[PDB]
Amino acid sequence: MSSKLNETTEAIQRELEETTYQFKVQYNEQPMSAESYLAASLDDFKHQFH
Amino acid sequence: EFASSFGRPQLQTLLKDALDQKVLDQLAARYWNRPIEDLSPAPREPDNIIDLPKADPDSPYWHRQLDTACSGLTRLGVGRLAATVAASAIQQHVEKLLDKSSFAKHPSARKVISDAAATVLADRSYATSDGIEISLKPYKFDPDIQPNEWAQGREHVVGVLQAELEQCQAAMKALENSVGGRKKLKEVMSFVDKARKGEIIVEGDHPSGAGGFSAALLARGREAVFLRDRADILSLRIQAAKSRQCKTLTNKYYCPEVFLDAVATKLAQTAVLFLNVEMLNDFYVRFPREVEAKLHEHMHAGGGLEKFAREDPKVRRHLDLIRRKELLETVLGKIEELHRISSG
Amino acid sequence: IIVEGDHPSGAGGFSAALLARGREAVFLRDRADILSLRIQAAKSRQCKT
């Protein structure tokens, strides 16, 4: 485990970078949460209803 | 001289070339026909491109198609494609210039210069990519198209598209001639058509002989049916792009070709501006220094100056000849001086 | 002319069933000729003794 530990640490830092890169190119880093989506769709609907 | 040639427009047409084939791939995978792999009936799609001109203006299919096509185009690795395409272009020019330069021989020095270019581009590669994506962030949300841009897209699409057609039509005709009669190729095509309809079933994943045709002939047949459908669609889509309906920018959903090509030329120029700055000037300024420093270190540290001299045969002798004549001369000097220090 | 036999139904510019009907016809031809030559010979003068 410990021997693999450092090479694993480096690969992990990389896959964290690439995960960031697609989070940048396809989503523009827009953070999302379940309660947020729910709050906004609710409000678009309550606008509609207004 | 080379750097005085390159500048920025060459990058412009470099980027626009890859982006062009991206458009074709996107446009093909969203509008045209999919290839024929087996001899089974294909399930009948409701919407077809032949009826694209005379379609309800507010069609959720054709809308979803052009919208997913464009966002699929823009949410691509344009930053990293501009970065690699420019990298391979600069490094390829340097290797040529090297091939014609006096470093044709001396492959270690030459490798020193090539690797210097490569390490410069590879050090600068990240900032250029990510920079280009960030500068493209506004154009990913609204690549708004001006009527002039729409015109430039229109003149391109006709060229690009007929280019796709000529390669198509030649290879159909090359097929007929290679299989035999035009009528015999019409025969396997009637048979593949029959099999693609209900008229006949074959039930084979790899059919060796059906209706008296070989496994080679069934492959030539499907090939023929794919070429025919995509040939007709392409001409139609060229007549679409030359129509009065596509001259204006208002039928954007009715002219996916012109529009996708407009977005491709725009994203090309704005990414190109950044590209030239971040990366090209970086080369022109880091390259000569890196070249000199790695050459010097390589010569003085590894002693490859001496091997650089030993490498060419003509200079191996020139330096050998000079050193021998020098040694004899100095010898005769020591003899005559010895007579001088001692009279007899 | 030579061909391989992953697909013995369809060869040449001749159809699957035409090939089939041709092979039967050739066998028929050969066996008929031999049978008739052998009847004309069984009735020949040289078979009398």
CB B291 within 8 A of CB B113: yes
Contact C10 B184 (CB under 8 A): no
3-state secondary structure of B210: strand
CB B309 within 8 A of CB B106: no
* Closest residue in B to C16 (Cα–Cα): B212
Rounded to whole angstroms, the Cα distance separating B261 from B267 reads 10
Which residues are C14's β-sheet partners? C11
* Among C7, C14, C18, beta carbon nearest to B209: C7
CB B82 within 8 A of CB B269: no
Contact B140 A24 (CB under 8 A): no
Six-digit token string for B28: 């093909």
Rounded to whole angstroms, the Cα distance separating B288 from B281 reads 12
Look-up: residue for tokens 């036999």? C5
| Contacts C9 to B, Cβ<8 Å | 209-210, 212
Cα B90 from chain centroid (whole Å):
14
CB B74 within 8 A of CB B26: no
* Among B184, B213, B215, beta carbon nearest to C6: B215
First and final CA of chain A: distance in angstroms?
60
Contact A25 B77 (CB under 8 A): yes
Q: Which residues, other chains included, contact B294 with Cβ-Cβ below 8 Å and sequence gap of 6+?
A: B112, B113, B115, B116
Neighbouring C-beta atoms of residue B59, cutoff 10 Å: 13
B326 burial (CB, 10 Å; 0-12 / 13-18 / 19+) is exposed
Nearest to B111 by CA among B295, B307, B312: B295
Contact B209 C9 (CB under 8 A): yes
Residue B137 forms contact with A (CB below 8 Å): yes
Residue C23 forms contact with B (CB below 8 Å): no
B73 burial (CB, 10 Å; 0-12 / 13-18 / 19+) is buried
Interface of A with B (CB under 8 A): 21, 24-26, 28
Rounded to whole angstroms, the Cα distance separating B241 from B247 reads 8
Neighbouring C-beta atoms of residue A26, cutoff 10 Å: 13
Six-digit token string for A30: 């827009």
Handedness of CA B270, B273, B278, B280 (dihedral sign): positive
Helices and strands, counts by H and E, chain A:
2, 0
Rounded to whole angstroms, the Cα distance separating B194 from B240 reads 31
| Contacts C18 to B, Cβ<8 Å | 212
Q: Which residues, other chains included, contact B324 with Cβ-Cβ below 8 Å and sequence gap of 6+?
A: none
CB B147 within 8 A of CB B281: no
Rounded to whole angstroms, the Cα distance separating C20 from B3 reads 72
Rounded to a whole number of angstroms, the distance from the CA of B282 to the nearest CA of chain A is 24
Look-up: residue for tokens 């379609």? B55
Six-digit token string for B162: 């007929």
Please tell me what resolution, in angstroms, this structure has.
Answer: 18.8
Contact B212 C6 (CB under 8 A): no
**Rg (Cα) of chain A, in Å, rounded?**
19
Q: Method of determination? A: cryo-EM
Rounded to whole angstroms, the maximal C-alpha distance in chain B is 123
Rounded to whole angstroms, the Cα distance separating A13 from B265 reads 36
B-C interface: how many C-beta pairs under 8 angstroms?
33
Look-up: residue for tokens 């290879």? B171
Rounded to a whole number of angstroms, the distance from the CA of B191 to the nearest CA of chain C is 12
Long-range pairs for B298-301 at CB < 8 Å and ≥24 separation? Answer: B298/B108, B298/B109, B298/B112
CB B165 within 8 A of CB B234: yes
Half-sphere exposure of B213 (CA within 13 A, CB side): 24
Rounded to whole angstroms, the Cα distance separating B131 from B133 reads 6
Handedness of CA B167, B173, B177, B183 (dihedral sign): positive
Task: Tell me how far CA of residue B124 lies from CA of B131, B168, B279, B287, in angstroms.
Answer: 11, 41, 7, 12
Residue C4 forms contact with B (CB below 8 Å): no
Q: What is the dihedral of CA A34, A37, A42, A45, to 10 degrees?
A: -150
Nearest to B49 by CA among B240, B222, B189: B240
CB C3 within 8 A of CB C11: yes
First and final CA of chain C: distance in angstroms?
46
Residue B215 forms contact with C (CB below 8 Å): yes
Residue B140 forms contact with A (CB below 8 Å): yes
Return the amino acid letter for B270. Answer: T
Contact A28 B77 (CB under 8 A): no
Contact C7 B184 (CB under 8 A): no
For B204, phi then psi, to 5°, come to -100, 135
* Residue B254 DSSP one-character state: G
* Closest residue in A to B130 (Cα–Cα): A21
Rounded to whole angstroms, the Cα distance separating A28 from B137 reads 8
| Best to test chain B binding among C1, C2, C4, C7 (most B CBs inside 10 Å) | C7
Rounded to a whole number of angstroms, the distance from the CA of A2 to the nearest CA of chain B is 32
Rounded to whole angstroms, the Cα distance separating B23 from B267 reads 12
Task: Tell me how far CA of residue A36 lies from CA of A27, A43, B240, in angstroms.
Answer: 16, 10, 44
Cα B258 from chain centroid (whole Å):
21
| Contacts A21 to B, Cβ<8 Å | 130
CB B200 within 8 A of CB B47: no
